Symmetry: none
Subunit: 124 residues, 2 copies
Amino acid sequence: PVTQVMTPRPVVFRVDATMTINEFLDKHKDTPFSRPLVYSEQKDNIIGFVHRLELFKMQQSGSGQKQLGAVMRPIQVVLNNTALPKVFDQMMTHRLQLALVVDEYGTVLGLVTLEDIFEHLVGE
Amino acid sequence: AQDVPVTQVMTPRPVVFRVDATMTINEFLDKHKDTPFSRPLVYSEQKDNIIGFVHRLELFKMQQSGSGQKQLGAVMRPIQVVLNNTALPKVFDQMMTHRLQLALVVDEYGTVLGLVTLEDIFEHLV
């Protein structure tokens, strides 16, 4: 059970894998969005996610011309019908900050974050 | 370039076994025979629409618990993807980092090319 007690958040912030780190930090300075997903060719085709702090560090290291696709964290999926404590245990154990939530028809429902899971469990 | 493509380490989609998630455990266990630790892939409506996998032994536990009438998807496990252009070392790192034993390989558009195991990648570089 996931969607049945926590609703997956919508994917609202997508960036192209071919976009460069410089371009990203350029276009999205002071962005309110903390969960930037990376898409490959179609905006529908999520292959990873990035963290702005991490990207900035790479830029300061002269890696600003690198493409998001080459430096992103790979996208991971969690099933809708998985127990929250288990999802939590898995994400923590793997240091996974966010995951796409998928149902039993292969449909992407939205995304969850480890902090979102934390916040829900802790409220119990 | 550097090493061989994950696409040569994988089992190609056409020869990859998968079963309908709506099949009951009872019918699956009766229809399909395979070893205690096999991990059949599961598809939703289309045979290419691969949405995870199940452990045969967990299927068998279910049946013996009197839940054989339930669908395969009852105990479905997620399956992750790796990109066809990812260097074999990086792939190895990524699956290890996430403790993956199995993963679908996809192209830049998300189309499943095949199934790669960590065992086969491990084998290859060590």
